[PDB]
């Protein structure tokens, strides 16, 4: 059996040698002459109130106006960000929700958590209420992230070291992804919706192909658990936050890490990572009660969204690119924006 | 402000009214997390507390003196704990069950208790110990075949605490054995915390009928201590 370990070590050495060969120049050296971004400041336009307990997940709509939120009081709320109105209030069967999703078409929302079920809620009914549509029931661990592809396909991640691709109408798994060795904590669908990534509490991230069911690449730069992941708008890169107080940028074709976002004053782990529209800004939420705006090319801190009284747990930037919304454990949800 | 926008504001007001009406139920409900190993005996505690008074979470409803209590036993989850234990912040109290008859896994239980106690998010959350299976511990100590000194050498130089309150007709040796384990847990309980949270020990068997009242009393004590510290009288 030892020859298997020897072969694994040999292939690992070959992979590391290829990575060293392709690393001709660091990203920072190339970006040395780029004009640094100024001090970005945001001024908390709307504060959304009404949740009774902690907030773990938020998701914007495709119209950049509607907004879903998951709280451990057992409520999903659909907000009208422009007006601070409450459109819907959906009570969940299980109070320990850990993720939520808003379908691209607007007709469905998803939720899930310690109860391993992922529940799809029909929003546009001829009866006027919001009903549970399906209850996906094949995960043997808590469900930490779920993201829609269509109105019939959803992709879930579980504490069970596996992701899945369900068929909502049937209610059965269509493909199970079984490469990780830890609890998958986050999930990010690519802009083209044929690939996606996940970080799974083993200091590694993996790129999967939705049709086939296999791990394309594996990225192993981090030191501790990976908590959040998100794609660059291009679709050829993604940033990852972790519990060792660092964010890192991975590119798929280079198959390495390009830049680590860190500071000696930060000894707290990231809980949410999102990009801006142009990819010039990387927003990351921390356990030290506030978020941070990074410059994804110069790796210099360029802002602090210090407005929360507790842990920041979720972070979303609209498709329009106009607003960023932050939810925290203080039962609030703030929508930030700039000023000219 | 258009007419439809006024109607939308009205619907939002009604939604907020229902939300406020649910806030009453939320703040009148106390959430407890039940933790234990496979041999702990948390199942019989649930059975005791429910007839009286691939799913990943079990909820148990019980009511003591018109005070609602919600308890949550974790089910179809893996053995790694450091990620889903954060969801149980801001709960009233954590209930920890230990099998005091199995000396081999006592150190594992102590390490688990230490990890729960020292976690960054569970620093304001008290723990209610349930030193389960005292009958087995008695039967094992009186019928001496397993020495506790083989696993904890400090038992040799140990004495029964002065404030011990033995049950009538109980051997001194079983009292010493049952208080040594409590002392081991309380050593971890007191070494840190800065006074923000405490451990309430209890010796329980599989035939007791007064555990819900114990949890009720301990939650009362937790809230009393919290409000006393807020008012700076303690």
């Amino acid at each position: 059996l030892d020859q298997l370990r020897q072969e694994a070590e040999q292939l690992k050495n070959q992979i590391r040698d290829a990575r060293k060969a392709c690393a001709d120049a660091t990203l920072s050296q190339i970006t040395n002459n780029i004009d640094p971004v100024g001090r970005i400041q945001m001024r908390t336009r709307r504060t959304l109130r009404g949740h009774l307990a902690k907030i773990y997940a938020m998701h914007w709509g495709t119209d950049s106006r509607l907004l879903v939120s998951a709280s451990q009081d057992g409520k999903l709320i659909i907000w009208d960000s422009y007006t601070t109105n409450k459109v819907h209030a959906i009570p969940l069967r299980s109070s320990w929700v850990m993720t939520c999703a808003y379908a691209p078409s607007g007709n469905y929302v998803a939720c899930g958590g310690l109860d391993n079920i992922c529940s799809i809620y029909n929003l546009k009914t001829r009866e006027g209420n919001v009903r549970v549509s399906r209850e996906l029931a094949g995960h043997t661990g808590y469900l930490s992230c779920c993201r829609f592809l269509d109105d019939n396909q959803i992709v879930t991640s579980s504490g069970d070291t596996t992701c899945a691709l369900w068929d909502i109408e049937t209610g059965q798994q269509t493909t199970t992804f079984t490469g990780h060795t830890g609890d998958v904590m986050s999930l990010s669908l690519a802009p083209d919706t044929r690939l996606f990534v996940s970080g799974a509490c083993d200091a590694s991230a993996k790129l999967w192909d939705v049709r086939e069911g296999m791990c394309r690449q594996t990225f192993t730069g981090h030191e501790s658990d990976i908590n959040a992941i998100c794609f660059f708008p291009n679709g050829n890169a993604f940033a990852t936050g972790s519990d060792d107080a660092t964010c890192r940028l991975f590119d798929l074709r280079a198959d390495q890490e390009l830049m680590t976002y860190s500071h000696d004053n930060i000894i707290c782990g990231i809980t949410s990572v999102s990009f801006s529209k142009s990819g010039r800004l990387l927003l990351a939420g921390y356990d030290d009660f506030n978020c941070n705006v990074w410059d994804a090319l110069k790796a210099d801190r360029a802002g602090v969204l210090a407005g929360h009284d507790n842990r920041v747990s979720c972070l979303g930037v609209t498709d329009d690119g106009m607003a960023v919304a932050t939810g925290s454990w203080d039962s609030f949800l703030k929508i930030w924006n700039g000023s000219s | 402000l258009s007419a439809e926008d006024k109607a939308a504001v009205e619907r939002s007001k009604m939604i907020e009214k229902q939300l406020q009406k649910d806030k009453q139920v939320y703040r009148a409900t106390h959430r407890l997390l039940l933790l234990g190993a496979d041999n702990s005996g948390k199942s019989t505690i649930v059975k005791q507390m429910r007839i009286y008074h691939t799913s990943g979470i079990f909820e148990t409803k019980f009511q003591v003196d018109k005070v609602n209590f919600h308890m949550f036993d974790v089910g179809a989850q893996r053995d790694e704990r450091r990620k889903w234990i954060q969801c149980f912040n801001d709960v009233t109290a954590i209930i920890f069950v230990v099998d005091s008859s199995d000396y081999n896994r006592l150190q594992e239980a102590l390490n688990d208790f230490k990890s729960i106690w020292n976690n960054r998010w569970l620093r304001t959350i008290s723990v209610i110990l349930f030193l389960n299976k005292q009958d087995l511990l008695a039967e094992k100590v009186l019928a001496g075949k397993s020495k506790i000194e083989d696993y904890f050498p400090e038992f040799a130089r140990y004495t029964t605490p002065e404030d011990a309150t033995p049950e009538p007709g109980e051997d001194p040796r079983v009292t010493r054995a049952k208080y040594f384990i409590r002392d081991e847990f309380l050593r971890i309980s007191t070494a840190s915390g800065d006074g923000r949270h405490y451990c309430y020990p209890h010796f329980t068997c599989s035939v007791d009928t007064e555990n819900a009242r114990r949890i009720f009393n301990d939650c009362r004590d937790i809230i009393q201590r919290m409000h006393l510290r807020q008012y700076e009288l303690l």
Partner: nanobody
Amino acid sequence: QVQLQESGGGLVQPGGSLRLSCAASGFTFSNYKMNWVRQAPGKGLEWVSDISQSGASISYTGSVKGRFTISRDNAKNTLYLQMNSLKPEDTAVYYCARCPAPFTRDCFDVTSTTYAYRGQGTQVTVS
């Protein structure tokens, strides 16, 4: 890549002594609490030692309190376990574990069945 190579096992008579070293690469050694994990054949997975990231706080299981010693060298990125007076109950596969998060005082999953930040193991046996 976070990896931990544990070496220094082998046969030893009762009353003999050994030393276990744990070369650690990839996770800025000085920031993490480190442990030693034992698995006797046919048994579960046990915790035998613990050392802080400075070397001040040291704990033991109790069955090995007076016999084993654990040290640390942050410069060479090594963890040491000086086994001194072994007995036949000590035969097992010894794992050099790392604690999940830096700067923390809680170590949750060091004894889990499939824990990422742990070594492959060294086999220590006693006649």
